[PDB]
């Protein structure tokens, strides 16, 4: 066993030297002469109200007009962000829901949580009422993040220290991803839908391969549980938020840290991370009722977006980058948008 | 400013909003209790009296509907999902007196009672359960009668100074759990002894739930 342990320790040191060799200069050093964004001030354009409990997830539709929010009330409302209309109100089987998703085609929405079951709902049906298309079972831990690839493929990351890929038609896990040692709290799907990362509680983020089924790269650097993750718009980077009150941006090709977005006056942990359309603004949802906007190339806060009473648990920028909703534990979503 | 279809879309939203309000004024009527037991200590004797992850046991007493969520099934980290329960009326903790000498099967080094104390330590002073009450339950007292005769209470606590009689041995165990309660200003942890046949367990939970309802009602009015 010691032989393997030493081979391990030796291999771990080998990759550390490889990462050190490739780090010619830090991301902050090179991006020093660029003009900073200045001061990004955002106003609450809409306040989607009607939830009766905390909010742990939201996902914008591909049209950038419909968003689905999940709450402890047991309701999964599909809002209409343009006119604040509740298109649907799906009553969940289990009120303990910690994740939600909108299918890229706009036909399905998925929810999951402490019930360890990912439920797929069919929005477009002849009967006119949303029905549970299929309940996906096979996880022995709380489900924390589910994201759709197509209308028949969904990736779920749960408390089973594993992430799984499902075939909605059959209802079984075609590919199961293993390797994490701690609870997996969030996952992000690449724009090409060929790779996806996952943020685990062991302060490690692993880049998986959906087609193959094994971890491609492992990223370390955090000091606490990684509570959120999101891909860069170009798909060659991702940002991790953790209870350490630090947001960190890694690179897939460099396979090492690039920058850390930290501040001495911030102690609460990040609950949600989402980039902008251009990949410059790093919206992050902290637990101090703020949504500090971090310049991803300067690591300087450019906004506070302080309009919430309780924690900003979930947030997401639209596909056209025209708005950034911020779900929160005070049962109110707010569609922020920077005016001219 | 609103089209014929747009006007009807708003009517759909208004109809949807009423259902949420109707289901929001009904969920608040129910009482949510988190049965956060120790490692295979209780959680089986009490649930029989009051009727793959979260399992919900729904029972009613005195025109009050209680929802009980046995979360002990999950083996994941407690901290990452326990904020979901912030807002429960009370926490029905369950400790078995019969484990005062038994050792953990998975560890064989740590006493089973000491395992319960360790979990109570973090839970009682958790950052989410400063206001929520804790209904501590001490079951399996029938077997505790015979077990204490064979072995004294010094097996778990060598600092104990007393005889093997049930009156003072059980009181020490109660006093041990009173110690770890640090927030002695906005939370009093209720204690109760139950066998496998008494039907007063539901009544004790209701009595402790009512004292939380009064505190919640006073907060709404403006006092407290």
């Amino acid at each position, epitope marked *: 066993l010691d032989q393997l342990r030493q081979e391990a320790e030796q291999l771990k040191n080998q990759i550390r030297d490889a990462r050190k060799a490739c780090a010619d200069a830090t991301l902050s050093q090179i991006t020093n002469n660029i003009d900073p964004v200045g001061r990004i001030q955002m106003r609450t354009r809409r306040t989607l109200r009607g939830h009766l409990a905390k909010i742990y997830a939201m996902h914008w539709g591909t049209d950038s007009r419909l968003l689905v929010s999940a709450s402890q009330d047991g309701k999964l409302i599909i809002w209409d962000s343009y006119t604040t209309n509740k298109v649907h109100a799906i009553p969940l089987r289990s009120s303990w829901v910690m994740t939600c998703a909108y299918a890229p085609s706009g036909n399905y929405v998925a929810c999951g949580g402490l019930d360890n079951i990912c439920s797929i709902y069919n929005l477009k049906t002849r009967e*006119g*009422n949303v029905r549970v298309s299929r309940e996906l079972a096979g996880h022995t831990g709380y489900l924390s993040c589910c994201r759709f690839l197509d209308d028949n493929q969904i990736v779920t990351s749960s408390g089973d220290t594993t992430c799984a890929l499902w075939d909605i038609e059959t209802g079984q896990q075609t590919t199961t991803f293993t390797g994490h040692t701690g609870d997996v709290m969030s996952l992000s799907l690449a724009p090409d839908t060929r790779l996806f990362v996952s943020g685990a509680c062991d302060a490690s983020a692993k880049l998986w391969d959906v087609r193959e089924g094994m971890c491609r790269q492992t990223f370390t650097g955090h000091e606490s549980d990684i509570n959120a993750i999101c891909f860069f718009p170009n798909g060659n980077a991702f940002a991790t938020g953790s209870d350490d009150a630090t947001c960190r941006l890694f690179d897939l090709r460099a396979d090492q840290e690039l920058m850390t977005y930290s501040h001495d006056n911030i102690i609460c942990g990040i609950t949600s991370v989402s980039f902008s359309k251009s990949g410059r603004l790093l919206l992050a949802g902290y637990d101090d009722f703020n949504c500090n906007v971090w310049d991803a190339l300067k690591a300087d806060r450019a906004g506070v977006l302080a309009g919430h009473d309780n924690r900003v648990s979930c947030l997401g920028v639209t596909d056209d980058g025209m708005a950034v909703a911020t779900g929160s534990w005070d049962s109110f979503l707010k569609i922020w948008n920077g005016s001219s | 400013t609103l*089209s*014929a*279809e*747009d006007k009807a*879309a708003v*009517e759909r939203s208004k109809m949807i909003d009423r259902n949420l309000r109707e289901d929001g004024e009904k969920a608040a009527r129910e009482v949510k209790l988190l049965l956060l037991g120790a490692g295979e200590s209780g959680k089986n004797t009490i649930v029989k009296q009051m009727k793959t992850g979260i399992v919900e046991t729904h029972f009613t007493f005195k025109d009050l509907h209680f929802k009980m969520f046995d979360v002990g099934a999950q083996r994941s980290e407690r901290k990452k999902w326990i904020h979901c329960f912030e807002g429960v009326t009370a926490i029905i903790f369950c400790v078995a007196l019969s484990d005062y000498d038994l050792v953990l099967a998975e560890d064989e080094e740590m006493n089973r009672m000491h395992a319960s104390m360790k979990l109570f330590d973090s839970i009682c002073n958790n950052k989410w359960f400063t206001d929520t009450s804790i209904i501590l339950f001490l079951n399996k007292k029938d077997l505790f009668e015979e077990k204490i005769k064979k072995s004294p209470l010094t097996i778990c606590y060598p600092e104990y100074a007393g005889s093997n009689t049930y009156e003072e041995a059980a009181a020490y165990i109660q006093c041990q759990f009173e110690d770890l309660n640090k927030r002695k200003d906005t939370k009093e942890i209720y204690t109760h002894f139950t066998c496998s046949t008494d039907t007063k367990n539901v009544q004790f939970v209701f009595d402790a739930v009512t004292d939380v309802i009064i505190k919640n009602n006073l907060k709404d009015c403006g006092l407290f």
Partner: single-chain antibody
Amino acid sequence: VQLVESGGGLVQPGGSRKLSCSASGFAFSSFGMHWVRQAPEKGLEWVAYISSGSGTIYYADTVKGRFTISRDDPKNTLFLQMTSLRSEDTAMYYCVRSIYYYGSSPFDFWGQGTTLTVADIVMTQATSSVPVTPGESVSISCRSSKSLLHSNGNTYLYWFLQRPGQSPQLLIYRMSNLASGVPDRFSGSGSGTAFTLTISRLEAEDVGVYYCMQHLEYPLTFGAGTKLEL
């Protein structure tokens, strides 16, 4: 989904009659209901409308103050009280379901049909009979009094096809989008006033009469009706 109606029959003028529309196979309480009648050897015209959770009972001008439409959600049945049945009232009445939200498909399903034998937007079609053959593309054009392009960007046009001895079927809604199950060969288009509908590969099942709806103003006036001949 299946809407079956009953209550039609011969009625003397000045009498009374009740039409019942039985809704089965879909969430009736969540669907707004319309009543549409069609005079024999003529087109369609809107009659009444009731909303889910009745709070909007808009009628047609020619029947306003004389016809009453009521829905019974618990039993899934739609009513229409016939009062002072005039000579013009003889027609075949259709039960229509509709749901209204973002991206919905109103006027989706139509009832089988029950026969009775006793300012507003204008929609006219230049042609009434187009002799066509399978394999060629034919365009059906309607007209409108004013632009139907609301400030939301939606143009409220609904197309329908009524094959002989059959209920109308939705083909194009909002002048841009197909309905459920409709062949992809249909493709609607047009501006607020410039107005047309194109069919690519005509077959033996595409014959019938094409009607165009305006839905911006609730009077809901149909079109003349372009009949396709094999």
